[PDB]
């Protein structure tokens, strides 16, 4: 069996020479070489079994990624396990290999507005793929965003991803939420389970404004601070926007803060693009049902240049106890298998 800082990486004899990328959820991502198809490829190994929630988002990504196809979604190319549930204990996904990440990009490079412009058309394209199979990824972010050297984009990480509901979408305030900070959107806080394409979208708008300054726009340390750094920036919601807001305690909350103005998009990124900063006034919009859609979006004037909805596929049909799991993720995984 391979070997990689100490723990067992045990992909061979098809995958050979690894190499340490970093950490996914459950486990280490390697690079190797390929023997069967001569280029090297990315393994993210998954030891989920003695857990009902990684057991749940081990086999909610698998079963989302086998049934997607499009460029912009990272596929599975091969899944590695033991050949029966006994002997079972871990899985490795095998996937195209992809040089960097936004996460890591942002970190280190300024974006010209040229690839700032290209990177939020592909994840735009590949979001209304997702979208229109009735799935909402829920946890993007620029670490979920792979880039290879050419700056092609592939979107991963669907273990949080969910079927559109937007009827059970309503809560009550301050309702414990799983997803990345940063990235929620702020009725995540006040009244939404999270269970609309708007959630997407505003996760997008910020990925936008991160790929203009290199900094996050709303870095909140906990919970309700997340909704200052917002409120901080977009001002105070209007009176409309706050009487879609039934809920009393979310709704008496907003009340009880001093007014703020909005900060103009223009003074935040000086160096902007005017119709960049248009489509991200549009996807930072409060109020979730005003906020744009992914179609919408794509069609806005920012992307002119790549805009074709005949290039812009969408999914062929809408997506549909721990022991019990473990036998879903292997039967899930079988076509995998010699034999
Ligand atoms: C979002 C995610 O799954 N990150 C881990 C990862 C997957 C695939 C891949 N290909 N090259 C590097 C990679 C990292």
Request: net charge neutral; hydrophobic share 35%; proline share 6%.
């Amino acid at each position: 069996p391979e070997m990689v800082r100490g723990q067992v990486f045990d992909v061979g004899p098809r995958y050979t020479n690894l190499s340490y990328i970093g950490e996914g959820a459950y486990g280490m991502v390697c690079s190797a070489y390929d023997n069967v198809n001569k280029v090297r490829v990315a393994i993210k190994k998954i030891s989920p079994f003695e857990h009902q929630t990684y057991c749940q988002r081990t086999l909610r990504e698998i079963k989302i990624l086998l049934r997607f196809r499009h460029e912009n979604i990272i596929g599975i190319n091969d899944i590695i396990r033991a050949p029966t549930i006994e002997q079972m204990k871990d899985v490795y996904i095998v996937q195209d290999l992809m040089e960097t990440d936004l996460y890591k990009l942002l970190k280190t490079q300024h974006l010209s507005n040229d690839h700032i412009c290209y990177f939020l058309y592909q994840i735009l394209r590949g979001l209304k793929y997702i979208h229109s199979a009735n799935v909402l990824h829920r946890d993007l972010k620029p670490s979920n965003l792979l880039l290879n050297t050419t700056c092609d984009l592939k979107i991963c990480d669907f273990g949080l991803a969910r079927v559109a509901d937007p009827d059970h979408d309503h809560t009550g305030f301050l309702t414990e939420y799983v997803a990345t900070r940063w990235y929620r959107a702020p009725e995540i806080m006040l009244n939404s389970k999270g269970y609309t394409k708007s959630i997407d979208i505003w996760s997008v708008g910020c990925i936008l404004a991160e790929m203009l300054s290199n900094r996050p726009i709303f870095p909140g340390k906990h919970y309700l601070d997340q909704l200052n750094h917002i409120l901080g920036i977009l001002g105070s919601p209007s009176q409309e926007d706050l009487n879609c807001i039934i809920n009393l305690k979310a709704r008496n909350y907003l009340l009880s803060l001093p007014h703020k103005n909005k900060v103009p998009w223009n003074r935040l990124f000086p160096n902007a693009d005017s119709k960049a900063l248009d489509l991200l006034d549009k996807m930072l919009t409060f109020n979730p049902h005003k906020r744009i859609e992914v179609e919408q979006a794509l069609a806005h004037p920012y992307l002119e240049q790549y805009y074709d909805p005949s290039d812009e596929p969408i999914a062929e049909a809408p997506f549909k106890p721990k022991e019990k799991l473990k036998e879903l993720i292997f039967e899930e995984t079988a076509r995998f298998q010699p034999g």
